[PDB]
Amino acid sequence: LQEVIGWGLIGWKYGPIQCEGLANLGVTQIACAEKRFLILSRNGRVYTQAYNSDTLAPQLVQGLASRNIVKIAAHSDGHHYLALAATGEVYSWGCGDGGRLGHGDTVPLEEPKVISAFSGKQAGKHVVHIACGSTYSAAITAEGELYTWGRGNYGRLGHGSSEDEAIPMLVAGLKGLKVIDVACGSGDAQTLAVTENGQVWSWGDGDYGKLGRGGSDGCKTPKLIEKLQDLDVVKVRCGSQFSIALTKDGQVYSWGKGDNQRLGHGTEEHVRYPKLLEGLQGKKVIDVAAGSTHCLALTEDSEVHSWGSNDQCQHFDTLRVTKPEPAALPGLDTKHIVGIACGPAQSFAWSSCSEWSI
């Protein structure tokens, strides 16, 4: 068996715990929502489990059996889900408020439904990435177009207004650039994106300087993060009121709200421009997972570092209520971890499910 480790506020357990129930599935991805998480299996099925259930027993998400799912998404402060099929179809379910499901109404859905706006597309118009905010959604096509939809407050969708959209809408401001990553926030939310030239963009609410251009002014269309504009950034992430960027050469920058040590720089001052996370210099980071107020980082050599809030034991290596600076979690160096994920009070890490790796 693959190893799947979890810790934090988990209701099935009487530090880190081995989740054999999840290992049986062959985990490739985990998307953490607010009360539950989705698990994608090697065979392209999707399962769901609540954090606070008495029993660990992931249940099959019905309505996807037809298709081979290759990506899932959800947001750690959210109540809706996206799933992406190998053939390109996008499914959505959960809460419908503000049009976040993308079906042109605000009806909530117990079961996955195809977003017909993305069906019947031709080649480079196929969706290849999906993302959720707390109240909105995004997707990227193979050509590099970015579509957003859902709640529009503070310009989080990037279309020059605060209008909600129940149907996916092209982000015109990036038309002409190839978008390769996007991340969505919560509360008064920011949105971040990365284009193939390695430049980085932000828009939405400006509180705590999470947009990365000083002060706290928001904006309603995508704008360049000038401090990152010479680095080859390849991924972005959003936690609650803060932002993360990761370079091709494994450096990490965090900025935004400072409370509860969520930025990892060692104090709780808000940081209004992207700042290099010194605690990880020397390590080559290959992924970062941002929960609400805590983060994990996976390195090339398979170490798993964490920092931030510890109000709910998100960090099993510290007794104090925060973990100010990044530091390797013990026990995990020897397990060949390849994936990490964070919920609002939860963290997961897994090794590979190839029966060959085992």
XYZ file of C-alpha atoms in Angstrom:
358
model
C 0.000 0.000 0.000
C 0.685 3.714 -0.808
C 1.046 5.953 2.296
C -1.541 8.622 2.987
C -0.904 10.642 6.130
C -3.300 13.171 7.664
C -3.328 15.378 10.722
C -5.253 18.254 12.259
C -8.943 18.463 13.163
C -10.053 15.000 12.128
C -13.059 13.345 13.670
C -12.466 9.624 12.878
C -9.241 9.357 15.011
C -9.671 8.582 18.717
C -0.027 13.448 15.808
C 0.070 12.291 12.162
C -2.224 9.402 11.258
C -1.999 6.751 8.580
C -5.209 6.743 6.550
C -5.358 3.204 5.141
C -8.954 3.803 4.044
C -7.638 6.392 1.567
C -4.628 4.366 0.447
C -6.960 1.626 -0.915
C -8.263 4.124 -3.446
C -4.837 4.936 -4.908
C -4.746 8.682 -4.287
C -3.477 11.033 -7.027
C -5.133 14.221 -5.787
C -7.018 15.620 -2.816
C -9.149 18.780 -2.942
C -10.041 20.139 0.462
C -13.308 21.993 0.978
C -14.572 23.455 4.262
C -16.435 20.469 5.798
C -15.206 17.710 3.518
C -12.636 16.693 0.937
C -12.643 15.067 -2.435
C -10.207 12.320 -3.375
C -9.300 11.436 -6.964
C -8.288 7.787 -7.530
C -5.750 6.347 -9.984
C -8.733 4.855 -11.913
C -10.387 8.261 -12.409
C -13.101 8.003 -9.812
C -13.895 10.636 -7.196
C -14.709 10.011 -3.530
C -15.889 12.267 -0.772
C -15.267 12.223 2.967
C -16.208 14.634 5.812
C -13.479 15.791 8.189
C -15.686 15.373 11.217
C -17.336 12.043 10.433
C -16.960 9.340 13.128
C -15.803 6.778 10.562
C -13.277 7.043 7.731
C -15.084 5.609 4.671
C -14.935 7.602 1.480
C -18.047 7.438 -0.598
C -18.190 7.369 -4.340
C -19.427 10.581 -5.906
C -22.281 9.417 -8.144
C -22.811 11.036 -11.550
C -19.179 10.803 -12.669
C -19.091 7.033 -13.362
C -19.539 7.785 -17.082
C -16.175 9.604 -17.333
C -12.464 9.406 -16.482
C -11.698 12.297 -14.105
C -8.197 13.740 -14.198
C -8.574 16.822 -11.974
C -10.613 17.992 -9.054
C -10.883 21.291 -7.270
C -12.410 22.915 -4.266
C -11.378 25.673 -1.875
C -10.638 25.237 1.814
C -13.270 27.881 2.838
C -15.740 26.671 0.140
C -18.824 24.489 -0.434
C -18.633 23.716 -4.134
C -16.587 21.388 -6.270
C -15.270 21.104 -9.809
C -14.153 18.010 -11.659
C -12.403 17.742 -15.037
C -12.630 14.774 -17.414
C -9.876 13.506 -19.696
C -12.153 14.315 -22.636
C -12.453 17.978 -21.487
C -15.927 18.129 -19.852
C -16.164 20.137 -16.602
C -18.601 19.156 -13.828
C -19.746 21.268 -10.913
C -21.826 20.723 -7.835
C -22.596 22.009 -4.344
C -23.720 25.531 -3.470
C -25.179 27.590 -6.330
C -25.207 31.101 -4.859
C -23.874 33.853 -7.130
C -23.663 31.483 -10.096
C -20.476 29.724 -9.017
C -21.557 26.392 -10.599
C -21.567 27.946 -14.086
C -24.967 26.679 -15.356
C -26.550 30.118 -15.854
C -28.653 30.081 -12.669
C -28.049 30.027 -8.879
C -29.536 26.598 -8.072
C -27.487 24.369 -5.753
C -26.778 20.769 -6.871
C -26.445 17.622 -4.815
C -24.764 15.839 -7.771
C -22.224 16.750 -10.480
C -23.580 18.409 -13.584
C -21.761 19.148 -16.832
C -21.074 22.808 -17.454
C -22.346 22.894 -21.021
C -20.537 26.195 -21.699
C -17.327 24.101 -21.961
C -18.778 21.114 -23.881
C -18.318 20.606 -27.655
C -15.176 22.837 -27.788
C -12.519 22.314 -30.520
C -8.996 21.170 -29.419
C -7.162 24.214 -27.893
C -10.478 25.426 -26.467
C -10.468 22.346 -24.143
C -10.168 23.045 -20.427
C -6.954 21.768 -18.822
C -6.973 23.415 -15.378
C -9.699 24.118 -12.802
C -9.854 26.143 -9.608
C -12.283 27.264 -6.947
C -12.575 30.248 -4.665
C -14.875 30.401 -1.656
C -17.621 31.865 -3.837
C -16.341 31.691 -7.421
C -14.632 29.474 -9.963
C -12.080 29.516 -12.781
C -10.746 27.427 -15.610
C -7.929 27.551 -18.144
C -8.032 26.229 -21.726
C -5.183 24.581 -23.642
C -4.754 27.834 -25.747
C -4.263 29.823 -22.492
C -7.620 31.597 -22.062
C -8.823 32.138 -18.501
C -12.551 31.963 -17.635
C -13.977 33.004 -14.289
C -17.520 32.926 -12.854
C -19.529 33.143 -9.615
C -19.636 36.077 -7.183
C -18.188 39.323 -8.467
C -17.725 41.361 -5.288
C -14.597 43.529 -5.274
C -13.789 42.524 -8.853
C -12.554 39.015 -8.088
C -13.690 37.762 -11.507
C -11.474 40.328 -13.324
C -14.011 41.732 -15.828
C -13.886 45.393 -14.758
C -16.945 45.352 -12.481
C -18.411 43.655 -9.410
C -21.156 41.825 -11.344
C -21.859 38.186 -10.558
C -21.653 35.723 -13.496
C -23.481 32.395 -13.658
C -21.838 31.417 -16.975
C -18.042 31.206 -17.507
C -16.656 34.453 -18.890
C -13.385 35.172 -20.657
C -10.932 37.334 -18.775
C -10.315 39.826 -21.639
C -7.452 41.570 -19.806
C -5.154 38.561 -20.331
C -6.299 37.839 -23.905
C -3.090 37.507 -25.958
C -1.084 35.903 -23.153
C -1.052 32.218 -22.387
C -2.303 31.712 -18.820
C -0.857 28.580 -17.164
C -1.963 28.799 -13.538
C -4.663 30.524 -11.521
C -5.605 30.582 -7.815
C -8.715 31.911 -6.073
C -9.193 33.390 -2.592
C -11.852 33.785 0.089
C -13.784 36.432 2.035
C -13.037 39.662 0.200
C -11.065 37.720 -2.272
C -8.087 38.188 -4.489
C -7.319 36.227 -7.619
C -3.831 35.399 -8.928
C -2.621 34.096 -12.253
C 0.556 33.205 -14.082
C 1.270 33.525 -17.793
C 3.795 31.407 -19.832
C 6.321 34.273 -19.782
C 6.526 33.667 -16.029
C 4.842 36.950 -15.153
C 2.270 37.144 -12.484
C -1.048 38.961 -12.184
C -3.450 39.875 -9.413
C -6.835 41.441 -9.043
C -9.825 41.600 -6.660
C -9.835 42.932 -3.105
C -6.726 44.769 -1.934
C -6.986 44.497 1.856
C -3.734 43.539 3.652
C -1.772 44.164 0.428
C -2.483 40.659 -0.836
C -2.468 41.958 -4.448
C 1.253 42.633 -4.085
C 1.440 46.312 -5.134
C 1.476 48.079 -1.742
C -1.311 49.665 0.258
C -4.741 48.190 0.218
C -6.484 49.371 -3.002
C -8.379 46.741 -4.974
C -8.771 46.417 -8.690
C -11.305 44.880 -11.032
C -9.102 43.769 -13.950
C -5.768 41.859 -13.962
C -2.641 43.814 -13.120
C 1.016 42.855 -13.103
C 2.924 42.151 -9.932
C 5.979 44.258 -10.728
C 8.134 42.849 -7.857
C 7.876 39.331 -9.338
C 8.337 40.502 -12.912
C 11.867 39.192 -13.336
C 11.452 35.777 -11.693
C 10.210 32.679 -13.513
C 7.156 32.034 -11.329
C 5.216 28.868 -12.228
C 2.506 28.405 -9.546
C 0.387 30.622 -7.343
C -1.744 29.832 -4.306
C -4.147 31.776 -2.111
C -4.805 31.185 1.584
C -7.145 33.380 3.608
C -6.201 36.963 2.756
C -2.675 36.037 1.620
C -0.897 34.983 -1.500
C 1.919 32.657 -2.530
C 4.140 32.340 -5.592
C 6.557 29.576 -6.451
C 9.445 29.859 -8.950
C 10.740 27.282 -11.434
C 13.954 27.153 -9.345
C 12.070 26.436 -6.117
C 11.894 29.738 -4.322
C 8.685 30.774 -2.509
C 7.261 34.234 -1.966
C 4.425 35.058 0.384
C 2.580 38.298 1.010
C -0.737 39.575 2.404
C -2.235 39.302 5.897
C 0.211 38.463 8.676
C -2.005 37.280 11.530
C -1.350 33.891 13.082
C 2.042 33.686 11.295
C 0.383 32.565 8.071
C 3.069 34.181 5.868
C 6.021 32.276 7.465
C 8.447 35.216 7.754
C 8.574 35.057 11.561
C 6.357 38.021 12.581
C 2.658 38.887 12.118
C 3.134 42.184 10.237
C 1.085 42.379 7.024
C 3.398 42.311 4.027
C 2.246 44.362 1.075
C 4.758 43.280 -1.558
C 5.916 39.742 -2.374
C 8.648 38.746 0.047
C 11.059 35.838 -0.266
C 10.398 33.152 2.350
C 13.919 32.880 3.833
C 13.205 29.756 5.922
C 13.071 27.688 2.684
C 16.149 29.126 0.907
C 18.525 26.224 0.310
C 15.600 23.926 -0.410
C 14.159 23.474 -3.875
C 10.385 23.600 -3.387
C 8.253 21.768 -5.971
C 4.794 22.403 -4.515
C 3.060 24.503 -1.879
C -0.392 23.856 -0.427
C -2.120 26.744 1.329
C -4.896 25.998 3.796
C -6.858 28.871 5.358
C -4.145 29.989 7.778
C -1.389 27.325 7.387
C 0.738 25.910 4.564
C 2.746 22.918 3.483
C 5.691 22.879 1.094
C 7.107 19.806 -0.631
C 10.757 19.807 -1.720
C 12.508 18.086 -4.652
C 14.254 15.790 -2.121
C 10.889 14.852 -0.571
C 10.946 16.889 2.695
C 7.633 18.342 3.865
C 7.842 21.772 5.571
C 5.010 23.626 7.276
C 4.291 26.958 8.982
C 1.474 29.176 10.174
C -1.478 28.814 12.488
C -1.672 25.927 14.951
C -5.027 26.618 16.687
C -6.267 23.124 15.641
C -3.015 21.125 15.641
C -2.333 21.681 11.909
C 1.294 21.089 12.893
C 1.975 17.917 14.829
C 5.566 18.957 15.612
C 4.770 21.982 17.799
C 2.794 22.495 21.031
C 2.502 26.320 20.667
C -0.492 28.022 18.947
C 1.616 29.077 15.939
C 4.628 27.808 13.977
C 6.279 31.117 12.987
C 8.851 29.858 10.518
C 9.002 26.945 8.070
C 10.647 23.749 9.271
C 10.682 20.131 8.130
C 8.092 17.908 9.696
C 9.767 14.828 11.172
C 8.939 11.266 10.175
C 8.180 12.200 6.532
C 11.639 12.485 4.864
C 11.762 8.698 4.337
C 8.301 8.113 2.708
C 8.862 9.546 -0.796
C 5.968 11.981 -0.537
C 4.763 13.282 -3.897
C 1.579 15.139 -2.968
C 0.345 17.520 -0.301
C -2.969 19.228 0.441
C -4.510 21.504 3.130
C -8.019 22.027 4.468
C -8.979 24.764 6.898
C -7.680 22.788 9.932
C -6.217 19.737 8.159
C -3.155 18.600 6.254
C -2.513 15.579 4.079
C 0.540 14.107 2.401
C 0.808 11.035 0.182
C 3.405 8.858 -1.474
C 2.856 7.524 -4.993
C 0.162 4.929 -5.779
C 1.899 3.183 -8.660
C 1.926 -0.527 -7.418
C 5.426 -0.409 -8.911
C 6.634 2.324 -6.466
C 5.254 -0.030 -3.724
